[PDB]
């Protein structure tokens, strides 16, 4: 679609809304919109003010201390895409110190071409976590949304679900909503940026964000590449040159813009490569008649002067003003106080420069891994040296690893002295390589290059050590490495051995238990032994060299490659979780868990079971005397040390791959003694753990306690009756007593005891004082299980 409205150059609004009227007809803004410093405003002043014409912003949007504003939905309802050609401190949209603001309300905003978004210090702002920036920003790692209401409180969010698509942020699906009334429009994943209509039909290839009629360059709300006469096109057709990377203009427009600057105070535009570029790059000069600049037959660079010869680089917008420069008549200090990497943009903006008249300084740049972005840096004249007569400066760079790639790069420093300090990951080898390649060897004095601070957390030993002997054992590992000797033997002060357990092969370089080894006395391989090492565990071990300052010399120590050695196996630990339950009178279930310390791959388990011998006292005790509650069930070493001195069959089975055991062929209701062992080695002199003891007794049967056989009686002349019944010689364990329940016909019933010794010695039981009549006797045997079935009534006459 077309853009009904003017180019409307980016403006600034301050202290009152009198200048908002200037946007009444603005459909596109060719610059930056900064609305800020609105102190005396009430919420009633913004309800009736709206700008539906505005669609796309080129540079950025700044909102800073606008009092009385609660939502931007009434301000820019049709803001779709922000190109971000020029950022505001590497941020394409900043909402800083906004009071009374509750929700953003930019429901129609789809893409942000370049830059990030920083929203900070707004204590009343909600609906922040409910926006999926991934579909909005192609890179969200540089966003900064902190010190707000959402992360300091728990204000509610109203999602228009019942509709609004839900997207997963880390591990759960959440609703994406701008306000309670409008929510984040999501297009199908097939069309990443061309935009979608309401029904899902994909827009034209040149469409961006939103469109009315799908697959039509004339119906694109926002042009993806360029704009011309309401037609988004891949490139500007001839003879229309490109302009500001978003539209195409004819020669008349560029000519008029150039001529308006000559008779005024500016950006006098020229023409190059079918574009209306402000100033074409180095080596080109623009003629008198036409506006095309031609390549000069000489070395004419584009020099970029500096305000008082001191420019600091801290952001993308601070370096983009150096785009296209080749020679700098000033000194650059690089200070990216960040925490995130910016080498990608810094490579594009910087890197085309060759000479630096002033000095170069790096200070506090936290995220600078390397200075490789200076792609074309060759010479540093250092005419205006930094204080202290310094031409190169590097101080407190927490991640500076390599200055350049000296193998393929070249450099030349004319004057000044170097300076390096507090670079914890830039070791001295790189500094020395630079001081050799540049040609400033005889220029620095003492303490110009710090030795302790530079690369103290790094490791560039660049020399190899080899282990001449590796031996493992039960708990001890013996190591020896070949001797190392720098040019001065006094430099070496010892070897530091790092060893750390690592079950997996993949181990990084540089936890890590450290052991100090004294230097060998000057064959004489230093060596060391480790003790207290758990068996059957892989270990990653390497050795490091400790040397002196090496300022006059160039000794960088040595290190050995990481070695993976595993200690051997041994006897395993005690098997764990032993339980012994009986599910059947002949079956016992056994459950046990593997020991805590396998100390080797367990091969098989060993278990032994046997029958205990019952208590003797159980057989010679009286079981009806009250209290009858039956329980329910070196000189050699001394001489050698002094003389020698160093110069200066129970049933069992092999249970394999099984933790649950059931045992058959067992006597019912009889205890058994079970000892269990674990074995991690079977054939070569089988190695097993200590015995784990457990005991269990099977549950009793139902017929063992019942007495079998009829009842036999004998009667003397005095009506004294001896009664006989054969005992169940195979009871539930054993029978402790018998009960004689005899009754007189029509009279009361009496009871009498038959103990074990009473039955055995008295050849049974003998009842005394039994009157003539018809008696009835039922006999019960009390075993260790319980009560048996009573015998049939004993009918007899005396």
């Amino acid at each position: 679609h077309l853009y009904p409205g003017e180019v409307c150059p980016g403006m600034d609004i301050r202290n009152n809304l009198t200048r908002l009227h200037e946007l009444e007809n603005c459909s596109v803004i060719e610059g930056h919109l900064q609305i800020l410093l609105m102190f005396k405003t009430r919420p009633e002043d913004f309800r009736d003010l709206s700008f539906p014409k505005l669609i796309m912003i080129t540079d950025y949007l700044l909102l800073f201390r606008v009092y009385g504003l609660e939502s931007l939905k009434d301000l820019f309802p049709n803001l779709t895409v922000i190109r971000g050609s020029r950022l505001f401190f590497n941020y394409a949209l900043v909402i800083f110190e906004m009071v009374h603001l509750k929700e953003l309300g930019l429901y129609n905003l789809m893409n942000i071409t370049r830059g990030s978004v920083r929203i900070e210090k707004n204590n009343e702002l909600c609906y922040l976590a409910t926006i999926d920036w991934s579909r909005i920003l192609d890179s969200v790692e540089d966003n900064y949304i902190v010190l707000n209401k959402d992360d300091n409180e728990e204000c509610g969010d109203v999602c228009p679900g019942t509709n609004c698509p839900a997207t997963v942020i880390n591990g759960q699906f959440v609703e994406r909503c701008w306000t309670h009334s409008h929510c984040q429009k999501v297009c199908p994943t097939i069309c990443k940026s061309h935009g979608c209509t309401a029904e899902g039909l994909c827009c034209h290839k040149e469409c961006l964000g939103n469109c009315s009629e799908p697959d039509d360059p004339t119906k694109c709300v926002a042009c993806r590449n360029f704009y011309l006469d309401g037609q988004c096109v891949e490139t500007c057709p001839p003879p229309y040159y490109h302009f500001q990377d978003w539209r195409c203009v004819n020669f008349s427009f560029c000519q008029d813009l150039h001529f308006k600057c000559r008779n005024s105070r500016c950006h006098q535009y020229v023409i190059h490569n079918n574009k209306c570029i402000p100033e074409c790059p180095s080596g080109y000069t623009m003629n008198s008649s036409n506006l095309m600049c031609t390549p000069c037959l000489g070395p004419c660079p584009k020099v970029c002067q500096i305000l008082e010869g001191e420019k600091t680089i801290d952001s993308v917008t601070s370096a983009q003003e150096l785009r296209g420069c080749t020679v700098i008549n000033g000194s650059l200090i690089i200070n990216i106080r960040g925490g995130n990497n910016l080498a990608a943009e810094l490579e594009a903006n910087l890197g085309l420069i060759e000479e630096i008249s002033g000095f170069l300084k790096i200070r506090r740049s936290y995220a600078l891994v390397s200075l490789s972005f200076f792609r074309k840096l060759h010479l540093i004249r250092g005419e205006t040296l930094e204080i202290g007569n310094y031409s190169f400066y590097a101080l407190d760079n927490q991640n500076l690893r390599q200055l350049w790639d000296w193998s393929k790069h070249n450099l030349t420093i004319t004057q000044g002295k170097l300076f390096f300090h507090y670079n914890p990951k830039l070791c001295l080898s790189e500094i020395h390589k630079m001081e050799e390649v540049s040609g400033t060897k005889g220029r620095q004095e003492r303490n110009d290059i710090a030795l302790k601070t530079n690369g103290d957390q790094a490791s560039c030993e660049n020399e190899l050590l080899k282990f001449s002997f590796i031996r493992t054992s039960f708990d001890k590992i013996l190591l020896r490495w070949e001797p190392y000797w720098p040019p001065d033997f006094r430099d070496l002060l010892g070897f530091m051995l790092f060893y750390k357990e690592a079950p997996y092969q993949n181990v990084t370089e540089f936890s890590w238990t450290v052991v100090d080894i004294d230097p060998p006395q000057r064959p004489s391989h230093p060596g060391w032994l480790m003790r207290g090492l758990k068996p059957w565990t892989q270990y990653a071990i390497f050795v490091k060299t400790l040397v002196t300052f090496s300022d006059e010399r160039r000794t960088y120590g040595a290190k050995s490659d990481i070695i993976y050695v595993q200690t051997d196996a041994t006897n395993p630990s005690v098997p764990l979780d032993p339980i012994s339950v009986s599910n059947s009178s002949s079956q016992i279930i056994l459950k046990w868990k593997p020991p805590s310390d396998p100390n080797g791959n367990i091969t098989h388990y060993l278990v032994y079971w046997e029958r205990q011998a019952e208590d003797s006292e159980l057989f010679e005790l009286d079981y009806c005397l009250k209290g009858l509650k039956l329980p329910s069930r070196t000189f050699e070493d001394y001489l050698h040390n002094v003389v020698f001195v160093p110069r200066p069959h129970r049933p069992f089975e092999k249970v394999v791959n099984k933790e649950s055991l059931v045992i058959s062929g067992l006597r019912h209701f009889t205890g058994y003694r079970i000892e269990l062992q674990a074995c991690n080695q079977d054939s070569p002199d089988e190695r097993c753990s200590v015995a784990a003891y457990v005991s269990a007794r099977t549950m009793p049967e139902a017929k063992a306690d019942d007495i079998v056989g009829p009842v036999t009686h004998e009667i003397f002349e005095n009506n004294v009756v001896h009664l006989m019944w054969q005992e169940p010689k195979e009871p539930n364990g054993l029978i402790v007593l018998y009960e004689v329940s005899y009754r007189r016909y029509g009279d009361e019933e009496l009871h009498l005891c038959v103990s074990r010794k009473h039955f055995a010695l008295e050849r049974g039981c003998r009842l005394r004082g039994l009157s003539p009549g018809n008696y009835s006797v039922r006999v019960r045997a009390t075993s260790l299980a319980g009560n048996g079935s009573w015998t049939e009534p004993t009918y007899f006459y005396v």
Binding site: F469, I470, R471, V565, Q566, D568
Partner: peptide, 29 residues
């Protein structure tokens, strides 16, 4: 082999592997 072989362990393992055929062991390379 499962673990590193050095010195007496190395020569004993080499003995067992070579068997009756015999071998020669010259560590000095």
């Amino acid at each position: 082999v499962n673990q590193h072989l050095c010195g007496s362990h190395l020569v004993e393992a080499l003995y067992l592997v070579c068997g009756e055929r015999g071998f020669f062991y010259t560590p000095k390379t």
